[PDB]
Structure formats: C-alpha cells, structure tokens
C-alpha cells in the first residue's frame, strides 16, 4: 500500500527519505558515499537511502505476499579501472541500519554474511568488484540476494556498459503470487539485462519493511554512484 | 540481437513496421482497429503491427533461449461500458498473419484456440472482455498465453484503471535462462500489476520470430486502443 516518485532529488527529500551512513543528496542526485572537495571518492565508505514509510510485505492473518515494482536510474562515475563496489536495492526491517562497507554494500556484516538466519535483508545487487577470495561468480555482475552475500541468481554485467558513461535504468518487480523477483537493467545503448528468480518474502523478512538503496566503496577510489531518480509501488 | 525504439509514430514507420488487418498509424499513434469518420470503432475488427526484423529466440546448435525486454504505452479510449477486446504483445513466426477478431485478439482462430499443437504464438494479453461462455477467468484481466486462448497465468485488471482515461505503461521481460516471462502494467496513478510465469520459448515457437502488438473488437463499439510508443531489446 505504498508508492512514491522521485523524478530527481532537488526537493526537500528528508521528509520521505532516511539517510544512513554517508548517504546524502548532491545536485538533484542521491549520492550514497562521500567524496573529497577534489571530488575523489573516500575509502571504505557505506551509505543507504531508505524510504521513511514502512511497506506491508505480507500479512500473517489475511495471508498473501505483496507485489511491487520499483524503478531507478543511476550513473557510475568511474575514473580508474578498479570500480568497486556498486549499489543495491533492498528491503529490510524498519529499524535496519547501515552495515559494513566493501563488498557488503552496507547490507551485511563481515562475519555473518553467509549465515541466512542472522540476516534480515533481500536485495538486488549491482556489483563491479572482482574479488576472487569472495564467494563468487567472481566477475562484475548483477545478482539477487536473500539474507546472504552468496546470490541465488546471478547475471554477468559486461564492462562496456559498466564503463559506458551512460545513465542506466534499473527495474525490479516482484509478483507476490508466483513469488518471482525480476530485475531488468537498461542502457540507452539498447543493451539490457533480464534476471528472474524465486524469492520467499514471507520466510526471509518481517511483515513490515523499509525499501532502500545502498552503495559502498572499498580500497580503490575509482567509483562514485549516483541515483538520479527512484519510483516505487507496492500492493498487498 | 534485435532492438528498436518508437518514441511515437510520426516517422515514416513502414520501413520497420508491418501492418496487418486494420492496423495503421494515427496521429503519432499506432491504431490497431479502424473507426468511422465520426470516430466510432468498427465491429469485429482485428489489427496487428509487427516489427519487420525477425528475432532469434533460440538457437538449435549453440543452444540457449534469448532474453528480451519490451515496453510500450497505450490508451484505452472507452465510451460505453462494454470495452472489448483489448490488445496483446506477442511473438509468432516471421510469416504469421492476422487471425480472428473478438476475444481472439487477431492471434487465434475460432476453432483451434485451445489446441496448442495447432498454434504458433506466445503472448501477453490485456483483456477487457467479460464473456462467461469463453474459457475463464471470466473478468477483465491481464494474462500470459502460450499457444492457447486459455492463459497459464492471469491477474485481474481493475476497472478503475481500465476506464482511468490515463496512459498505461506495459513492461514485458523474458529471462531466457530462468525461462520466466514477467509483465508489469503501470498507471501514473501509481497502481501497478506484476505477473510472472514460466514459459518455454524453445518448445512453443520456432527459432525466428516477429514481435508485435494486436487488438480486436467484437460486437460493442465502445473501445479504441492506441499504442503511443514501443521499445524493444533482445539478446541471445
Ligand atoms: C549533507 O551534506 C551537506 C553538505 O553538502 C551537509 O551540510 C548536510 O549536513 C548533510 N546532511 C546529511 C543528512 O547528511
Ligand atoms: C555490523 O557492522 C556495523 C557497521 O560497521 C556495526 O556498527 C555493527 O555493530 C555490526 N554488527 C555486528 C553484529 O557485527
Ligand atoms: C492507413 O490509413 C490511411 C488513412 O488515414 C490510408 O490512406 C493508408 O492507405 C493506410 N495505410 C495502411 C498501410 O493501412
Ligand atoms: C484463421 O482466421 C483467418 C482470418 O479470419 C483466416 O483468413 C484463416 O483462413 C483462418 N485459418 C483457419 C485454419 O481457420
């Protein structure tokens, strides 16, 4: 029963948005991590923007899982060749706070990343990191995660797009009936990515959630992520 | 390996588009069925617009099913209260021609509508008809069809939106890996519809297809459907 539209971020914004970590607005943009005055991205930073109004994912009683659609556009301002880590759209309990930086995208802690029982987060990640010592695919990719840093579904994200210097459009939908989460990543280039997989929102998250977007940086300082717009709609 | 963008239909259009049945352009719009000079919709009409370039759905040899995304906006110009039948996005062999009008949306013939073996068409229908003598749901709805007029997945389409008098956005994606077809129907009102289900493009259609949109009318003359824009992207 929640829907919102942010054509950009020049409005006040802090009514409807909750900023965690480095998260802040920057020129009608949503900037998740912080940068120098010389515009260089700070190391090991995490940031998340959450919509201030909770969403009914499921209802114990009247029993069924909500369906929702979300859309947002972003830009990967990349300088060097070690872009990391990226961003993610996610759902979490209303009181969730930012987590670890690095490949955790401020969604997971270093120690319990793989233990589903100790987590409250379902997300769609857009990863540009390439750390082999981390649970794979091991290459830059788009993935769906359910209370774990090891994705149930992954789709490779070609560098030609990642470093395109173009605005990408992310479309995430969830059919709370067929319980299928779909992710479509579009580039004006025409190139698109479609990723779909089963997710049980009832078994992994509480009845009420907060929807948000987060980013994090690691060692390198070659990446800055900007969210230019974000729309959302849910129905239970 | 095919992608196109029609922000509207004021360009020449007939290079890239193939008009079948009543299909024709009308004021930067795609008008599938014909109307009076008094603008009244003609009875029992069918029309389909097909993209002139074939799409590789699957490849026998190098074996895998393509993934694709499609988007289009439309308007339901409804006068009376018997809007019928609606429109559909679909895939068919390159040489497919328009079929029966009525609840067949120019995609099926009256006699073999339910016999999957005698059909070559996978589609997403947006039905406004309410004929109880027809294979149900029996109420106005959005549905996914695979070589049959009886949908594998259906989602109810509330009248408040159907008769909204607003522009609707249809988003259809297919993950040729997880083999999941998703449909998101959006209204500026915020109201959205998410429908996902399994579809085997390899078993129901030939290697090469034509993507298109079609509409049809029955007895009533209370409906005219317009497609304002249509973008598409496929990758095998
Ligand atoms: C956002 O950044 C500005 C500087 O551009 C600062 O003045 C403000 O306090 C910050 N607000 C939040 C919520 O981080
Ligand atoms: C998780 O990481 C955050 C941020 O570093 C920290 O404040 C919190 O205490 C950590 N929680 C656990 C269980 O490690
Ligand atoms: C389309 O309709 C116009 C009238 O508006 C007509 O002149 C033209 O021949 C038609 N073309 C096709 C392909 O139907
Ligand atoms: C299907 O319907 C079309 C349009 O009415 C017709 O031309 C065609 O011959 C029909 N085919 C069959 C097998 O009935």
Description:
Two copies of one chain form a homodimer. With 236 residues, the first copy, chain A, is mostly beta strands. Chain A has a single domain, classed as Jelly Rolls (Sandwich), CATH 2.60.120.200. Helices cover 3% and strands 43% of the residues of chain A. Chain A has two helices and 16 strands. The first copy, chain A, has helices at residues 159-162, 201-204, and strands at 3-6, 17-21, 24-26, 29-31, 46-51, 55-56, 67-78, 86-92, 122-127, 141-146, 153-156, 168-175, 180-186, 192-198, 208-216, 223-235. In chain A, strands 1, 3, 4, 7, 12, 13, 14 and 16 form an eight-stranded antiparallel beta sheet that branches. In chain A, strands 2, 5, 6, 8, 9, 10, 11 and 15 form an eight-stranded antiparallel beta sheet that branches. Chain A starts with a strand and ends with a strand. In chain A, 50% of the residues are buried. The interface between A and B is medium-sized, with 28 and 28 residues. The structure holds 2-acetamido-2-deoxy-beta-D-glucopyranose (4 copies). Chains A, B: Keywords: Calcium, Lectin, Metal-binding.
């Amino acid at each position: 029963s929640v829907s919102f539209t942010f054509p950009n971020f020049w409005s006040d914004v802090e009514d409807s948005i909750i900023f965690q970590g480095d998260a802040n607005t920057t020129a009608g943009t949503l900037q998740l991590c912080k940068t120098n005055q010389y515009g260089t991205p700070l190391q090991w930073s995490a940031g998340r923007a959450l919509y201030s109004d909770p969403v009914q994912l499921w209802d114990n009683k009247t029993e069924s899982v909500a369906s929702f659609y979300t859309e947002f556009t972003f830009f990967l301002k990349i300088t060097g060749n070690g872009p990391a880590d990226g961003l993610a759209f996610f759902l979490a309990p209303p009181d969730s706070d930012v987590k670890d930086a690095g490949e955790y995208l401020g969604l997971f802690n270093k120690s319990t990343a793989t233990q589903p029982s100790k987590n409250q987060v379902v997300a769609v990640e857009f990863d540009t990191w390439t750390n082999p010592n981390f649970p794979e695919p091991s290459y830059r990719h788009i993935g769906i995660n359910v209370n774990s840093i090891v994705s149930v579904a992954t789709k490779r994200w070609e560098d030609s797009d990642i470093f395109s210097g173009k605005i990408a459009t992310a479309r995430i939908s969830y059919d709370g009936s067929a319980e299928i989460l779909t992710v479509v990543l579009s580039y004006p280039d025409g190139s698109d990515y479609i990723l779909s997989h089963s997710v049980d929102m009832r078994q992994n998250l509480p009845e009420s959630v907060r929807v948000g977007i987060s980013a994090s940086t690691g060692n390198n300082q070659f990446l800055t992520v900007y969210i230019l717009s974000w729309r959302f709609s849910s129905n239970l």
